[PDB]
Amino acid sequence: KPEDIDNNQLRYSYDNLIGSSQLELDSEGQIISEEEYYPYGGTALWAARNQTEASYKTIRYSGKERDATGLYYYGYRYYQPWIGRWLSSDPA
């Protein structure tokens, strides 16, 4: 467990129109992190009250998790936010 993070902490997520976790509030409604994105998925803004606490935000843009490779997982394909294109073709 981290040193300055209470156990079984609560992270409330408040999202945009497409479902991107812009903010994060504490159990007492305190600002935890702030984030805005480039329209095509890129990350244009990233801020938080502490570094270690911020590194646990897995879901960010469109309700998807950014992996350590920088790609976004969607279930059926992976999305490259920089060039604004999918990693592969449509299975359907």
Bridging pattern class, strands 21-25 and 72-73: unpaired
Query: Resolution of this PDB entry, in A?
Result: 3.7
C-alpha to C-alpha distance for 74 and 35, rounded to whole angstroms: 20
Q: How many CA atoms lie within 13 A of 47 on its CB side?
A: 6
Alpha carbon of 11 to those of 29, 35, 44, 56: distances in Å? 9, 15, 22, 10
In the block, tokens 């992976």 appear at 78
